[PDB]
């Protein structure tokens, strides 16, 4: 179990850690989050009490370094930093724990939600989507645009998701125009899986990361990416059986975790109706279809 | 974006453009089988690809053999249309290729866009105009060449005959669309109007009769009357 120490909390803020959240008052004696499970990526995220504009946060993996949060009064945000002096860090944490100044990561033992949401998400792939090589952790916020959004403007602050475009020469083999547009299996399996992602695990990892950025930061380009990656699979007649079964589980836990009151903005009616009721895979996502119909029957 | 009454004069500017109409590509007769079921029999069709400024018509004849052994023919017909239009564009010299292609039915947008990915600078546009190009097969010489075809074939026509020697392309298009709207609303009456007077003939190299300017005014008036009539006969007014 690892710890993320906070130097202080000078401004009132709602702090998220993965799917959990708690309120911290202005100058409250809050010194961080303990008992963070090892083995998963995590995200620690922020929404200031005075400007709910800009949710922002940091993806990290405690196996990769000792990380802490300190507020910057000049840039006006809580920043993640790495402490390279391991003994200074252990001493800081132990003092904070002795004074009981930390919240405990509040995981129920039965509860596999976070594993299920991050099963294929790796820090090394996050760091290629979010490019800032000098840090081991990755900053994301509500406003950051994706590479694809920029082609349709600061490249260093972009989300470099894999570009998916169904009406593109990459997607459509000359001479197979109708075939490839109506059945996207060659784009899924040859172009993307074999060519770009190399395996389905990396594809699912990017899909899961895109959803989490959509949910936690309201990042619109991430929501677009999540739906495009779903639609590319559902619109393929030929998909490995293990991928369909795994996609059904992935989406089930995503839909289960979504706040009920955000379904209007985070769920694209066209994609979901097409995927569940019209597509090649309309009969292959039983768990996802069942939770969608019981939780969001309006969208459909 | 979409082509409508507001941007109508754009059709007659000097940017090359083509209308594409696919409503006569896949044509069938519906009939009973010996067992009392229903079946279709395809007949030859055509893509109607028209330059509204010059009158040049690229009539690609669709022979029934293209449907043999194929499924979902109405869907295939849209993609076959887009394949043939793309092939036409590639066959033209660069300076003759269109800058825009306007499809008369929105279901042609994605098929044509996908087939024209190699031409990112050619705009594919829908229209809100309800153009009567389906009636092209009421023009006897066009119907004749389509029905006689024994293989795929492209035939080039000028759908304005020699009208552009005397009138503008705006006026020629308006005459064409009036003639075709009439033929679509009451083909028998429209054809009676066009051929009632045996002293006005159709030149061998033309599609329409050789009307004088004054006779065209009479003809055009008779077509408006027909369209309005039928509009009454229809709705009872
Ligand atoms: C590099 C890092 N600096 C901190 C600072 C924490 C802090 O405010 N204090 C007062 C440390 C208390 C003692 N000993 C945590 S991790």
Notable traits:
heterodimer; A: 300 residues; alpha+beta; five-stranded antiparallel sheet; 16% strand; elongated; B: alpha/beta; Nucleotidyltransferase, domain 5; Acyl-CoA Binding Protein; 2 domains; six-stranded mixed sheet; 6 helices; 8 strands; binds the ligand Cc1nc(/C=C/C(=O)N(C)CCC#N)cs1; Pre-mRNA-splicing factor 8 (chain B); AAR2_C_sf (chain A); AAR2 (chain A); A1 cistron-splicing factor AAR2 (chain A)
Distance between the termini of chain B: 37 Å
SS element count, helices of chain B: 6
Largest beta-sheet details of chain B: 6 strands, mixed
- Report the β-strand fraction of chain B as a percent range: 15-25%
Strands ordered across the widest β-sheet of chain A: 3-2-5-6-10
Bound molecules: the ligand Cc1nc(/C=C/C(=O)N(C)CCC#N)cs1
Helix content of chain B: 25-40%
The percent of residues in helical segments of chain A reads 40-55%
Which strands sit side by side, in order, in the main sheet of chain B?
Answer: 7-6-1-4-5-8
Quaternary form: heterodimer
How much of the sequence lies in strands of chain A comes to 15-25%
Largest interface: A-B, 8 and 11 residues
| Second-tier CATH architecture of the largest domain in chain B | 2-Layer Sandwich
String of helices and strands of chain B: EEEEEHEHEHEHHH
Tell me the Rg of chain B in angstroms.
Answer: 19 Å
DSSP helix count of chain A? 12
Return Rg of chain A in Å.
21 Å
CATH fold field value of the largest domain in chain B: Nucleotidyltransferase, domain 5
Shape of chain B: globular
Subcellular location (chain B): Nucleus
Protein name (chain B): Pre-mRNA-splicing factor 8
Region (RNase H homology domain) (chain B): 7-237
Organism (chain B): Saccharomyces cerevisiae (strain ATCC 204508 / S288c)
């Amino acid at each position: 179990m690892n710890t993320v120490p906070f130097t202080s909390a000078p401004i009132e803020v709602t702090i998220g850690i993965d799917q959990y959240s708690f309120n911290v008052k202005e100058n409250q004696p809050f010194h961080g989050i303990k008992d963070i499970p090892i083995g998963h990526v995590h995200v620690i995220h922020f929404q200031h009490a005075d400007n709910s504009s800009m949710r922002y946060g940091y993806w990290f993996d405690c196996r990769m370094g000792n990380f802490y949060i300190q507020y910057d009064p000049k840039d006006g945000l809580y920043k993640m930093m790495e402490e390279r002096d391991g003994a200074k860090f252990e001493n800081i944490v132990h003092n904070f724990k002795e004074r009981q100044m930390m919240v405990s990561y509040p995981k129920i033992d039965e509860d596999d939600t976070w594993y299920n949401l991050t099963e294929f998400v790796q820090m090394d792939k996050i760091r290629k989507i979010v490019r800032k090589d000098e840090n081991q952790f990755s900053y994301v916020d509500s406003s950051m645009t994706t590479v694809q959004e920029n082609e349709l403007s600061d490249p260093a602050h972009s989300l470099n998701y894999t570009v998916i475009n169904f009406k593109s020469r990459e997607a459509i083999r000359p001479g197979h125009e109708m075939e490839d547009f109506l059945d996207k299996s060659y784009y899924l399996n040859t172009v993307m899986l074999q060519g770009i992602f190399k395996n389905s695990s990396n594809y699912f990892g990017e899909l899961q990361f895109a959803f989490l950025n959509a949910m936690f930061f309201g990042n619109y380009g991430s929501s677009l990416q999540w739906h495009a990656m779903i639609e590319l699979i559902c619109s393929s007649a030929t998909v490995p059986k293990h991928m369909l079964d795994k996609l059904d589980e992935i989406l089930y836990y995503q839909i289960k975790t979504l706040p009920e009151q955000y379904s209007d903005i985070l769920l694209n009616e066209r994609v979901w109706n097409i995927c569940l009721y019209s597509s090649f895979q309309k009969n292959s996502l039983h768990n996802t279809e069942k939770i969608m119909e019981n939780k969001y029957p309006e969208l459909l | 974006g979409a082509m409508n009454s507001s941007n109508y004069a754009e059709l007659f500017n000097n940017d090359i453009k083509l209308f594409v109409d696919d409503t006569n590509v896949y044509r069938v007769t519906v009939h009973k089988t010996f067992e009392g079921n229903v079946a279709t029999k395809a007949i030859n069709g055509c893509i109607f690809t028209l330059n509204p400024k010059t009158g040049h018509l690229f009539l690609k004849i669709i022979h029934t053999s293209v449907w043999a052994g194929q499924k979902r023919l109405s869907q295939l017909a849209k993609w076959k249309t887009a394949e043939e239009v793309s092939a036409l564009v590639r066959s033209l010299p660069k300076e003759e290729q269109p800058k825009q292609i306007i499809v008369t039915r929105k279901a042609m947008l994605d098929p044509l866009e996908v087939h024209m990915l190699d031409f990112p600078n050619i705009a594919i546009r829908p229209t809100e105009l309800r153009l009567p190009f389906s009636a092209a097969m009421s023009i006897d010489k066009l119907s004749d060449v389509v029905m006689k075809a024994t293989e795929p074939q492209m035939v080039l026509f000028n759908i304005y005959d020699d009208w552009l020697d005397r009138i503008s392309s705006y006026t020629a298009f308006s005459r064409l669309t009036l003639l075709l709207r009439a033929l679509k609303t009451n083909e028998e009456s429209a054809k009676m109007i066009l051929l009632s007077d045996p002293t006005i003939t159709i030149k061998s190299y033309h599609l329409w009769p050789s009307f004088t300017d004054e006779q065209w005014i009479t003809i055009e008036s008779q077509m408006r009357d027909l369209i309005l009539t039928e509009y009454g006969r229809k709705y009872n007014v």
